[PDB]
Amino acid sequence: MVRIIVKNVSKVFKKGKVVALDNVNINIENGERFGILGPSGAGKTTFMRIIAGLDVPSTGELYFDDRLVASNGKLIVPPEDRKIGMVFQTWALYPNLTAFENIAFPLTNMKMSKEEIRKRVEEVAKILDIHHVLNHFPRELSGGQQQRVALARALVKDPSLLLLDEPFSNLDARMRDSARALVKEVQSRLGVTLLVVSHDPADIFAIADRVGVLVKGKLVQVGKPEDLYDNPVSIQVASLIGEINELEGKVTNEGVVIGSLRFPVSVSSDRAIIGIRPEDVKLSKDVIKDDSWILVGKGKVKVIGYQGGLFRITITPLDSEEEIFTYSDHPIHSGEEVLVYVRKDKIKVFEK
Numbered sequence: 001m002v003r004i005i006v007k008n009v010s011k012v013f014k015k016g017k018v019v020a021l022d023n024v025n026i027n028i029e030n031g032e033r034f035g036i037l038g039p040s041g042a043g044k045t046t047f048m049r050i051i052a053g054l055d056v057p058s059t060g061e062l063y064f065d066d067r068l069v070a071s072n073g074k075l076i077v078p079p080e081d082r083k084i085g086m087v088f089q090t091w092a093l094y095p096n097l098t099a100f101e102n103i104a105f106p107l108t109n110m111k112m113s114k115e116e117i118r119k120r121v122e123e124v125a126k127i128l129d130i131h132h133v134l135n136h137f138p139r140e141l142s143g144g145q146q147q148r149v150a151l152a153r154a155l156v157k158d159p160s161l162l163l164l165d166e167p168f169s170n171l172d173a174r175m176r177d178s179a180r181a182l183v184k185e186v187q188s189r190l191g192v193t194l195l196v197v198s199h200d201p202a203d204i205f206a207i208a209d210r211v212g213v214l215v216k217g218k219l220v221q222v223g224k225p226e227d228l229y230d231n232p233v234s235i236q237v238a239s240l241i242g243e244i245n246e247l248e249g250k251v252t253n254e255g256v257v258i259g260s261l262r263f264p265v266s267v268s269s270d271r272a273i274i275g276i277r278p279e280d281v282k283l284s285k286d287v288i289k290d291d292s293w294i295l296v297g298k299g300k301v302k303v304i305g306y307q308g309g310l311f312r313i314t315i316t317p318l319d320s321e322e323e324i325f326t327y328s329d330h331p332i333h334s335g336e337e338v339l340v341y342v343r344k345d346k347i348k349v350f351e352k
């Protein structure tokens with residue numbers, strides 16, 4: 001419901017020694033679900049605090065629709081006037097206010113009567129299915145209920161923009177899919193612009209339609225999540241959007257050579273970095289009968305792990321310490337020699 005224009009936004013700390021954001025430019029469309037991923041929780045948080053109005057750009061400008069909200073060290077439109085709801089891992093529920101009180105809090109100075117506040121709080125709580133625990137303090141709420149109360153608090157003033165900073169990080173891993181689905185439902189229902197920052201790509205895949213990746217304060221790539229996943233600009237971006245094996249080898253006429261492995265790709269440099277995601281690797285003891293996989297050579301099993309009911313099999317090529325891991329239903333025991341197949345079209349290569 002609001003367009004956000006981020007224009008040459010930079011932010012420094014420590015009198016300039018730390019550059020948290022460096023000339024960031026993004027135009028977020030009204031109702032878009034946009035995500036940010038990157039190695040720096042602090043920098044992503046810096047970006048979110050600037051959008052919220054809790055901080056300002058050192059240089060550059062920020063617009064909500066055609067409205068200049070911050071510019072060159074100045075806060076022009078404060079948080080309370082920006083039509084934003086915040087769900088931030090760092091903004092907890094107030095422990096000694098009930099759920100009702102926590103959700104009513106933002107309405108305190110909105111010129112509403114007691115009945116108007118009650119009606120609005122009850123309406124939102126009904127929609128989020130926490131109307132029956134309004135009298136509980138936060139400690140007496142389940143995790144899911146706490147999540148819902150925090151979202152209700154963010155939605156009580158009918159915002160145009162919902163800002164989420166590590167919003168599911170307090171939940172047990174098993175409850176996060178449900179929380180991601182709730183946010184999806186709320187966004188669809190309200191049509192709000194939504195910005196989400198997270199270290200976890202599952203959050204971005206579940207919620208965002210376009211994502212930017214921040215590295216050293218710079219937006220290095222922006223696109224649909226699946227596009228970053230398959231066509232990352234660098235191995236660093238490749239790894240931020242999902243698991244990937246990173247290998248280094250020599251460029252030859254026959255491919256990139258890494259011990260007993262040879263990948264049928266090339267770059268102009270003497271050496272190359274190969275990226276191959278675990279789902280794009282398959283192991284066998286003899287040749288398989290499947291033209292959708294290509295042989296890249298022999299390897300030896302180094303170690304096995306067990307996660308998610310699957311075996312995580314790590315191999316190395318012969319005559320190399322480089323590792324490749326993949327997941328499988330059955331193990332191949334340590335020390336075994338195996339053939340290594342990959343999906344040809346999924347090999348990522350970069351100049352070293």
